[PDB]
Amino acid sequence: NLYQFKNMIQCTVPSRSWADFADYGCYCGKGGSGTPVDDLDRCCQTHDNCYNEAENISGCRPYFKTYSYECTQGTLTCKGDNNACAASVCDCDRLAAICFAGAPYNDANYNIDLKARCN
């Protein structure tokens, strides 16, 4: 779920408030359209698409589905006890958190005008 995804970001990016990623570019947060503005936005575009795919699984709701994962000693791992829905969503979240940690954060791209800039 989103609480778990937030804790994944706190584990891989402990310099910064998860809220920094909640409204960035065209894809991070609410947005899901237009041309990704940078590398970080591209992480979010892949994450958004990943969730759309997981939604094809019967009864699978990536926003709410609780999966099993661990984050210790610099390592994020989705555990073996996950069903097909949990496993897919966990992996979407894990790959995004890792992506976030490697991409540069441009303060100019936070809270941009989606209606104007994400067509």
């Binding site: 995804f5 937030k6 809220a19 909640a22 409204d23 995004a96």
Partner: peptide
């Protein structure tokens, strides 16, 4: 904390 929608 929040219930802001997402961190996509």
């Amino acid at each position: 904390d929040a219930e802001f929608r997402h961190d996509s």
